[PDB]
Amino acid sequence: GITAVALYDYQAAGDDEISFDPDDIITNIEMIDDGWWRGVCKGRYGLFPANYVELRQ
């Protein structure tokens, strides 16, 4: 599976996107859009602002 980590604290603009703390790491992060991502944060899926998040490996 995939897993990302927020480089900084960001707040999702729309309901389609979720927010997550920097140190707060999450899993199942799959890239749907070349500019946007998606993953499960604390048991919830959503969109990941590529500007404030990064997929680990």
């Binding site: 900084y8 960001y10 603009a13 749907i32 859009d33 500019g35 946007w36 602002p49 590529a50 500007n51 404030y52």
Partner: peptide, 19 residues
């Protein structure tokens, strides 16, 4: 269409456009 670019990245050395 689901095309949308992420917001700008925060910077400390950034300066305003209006002086």
């Amino acid at each position: 269409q689901r095309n949308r670019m992420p917001p700008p990245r925060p910077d400390v050395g950034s300066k305003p456009d209006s002086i």
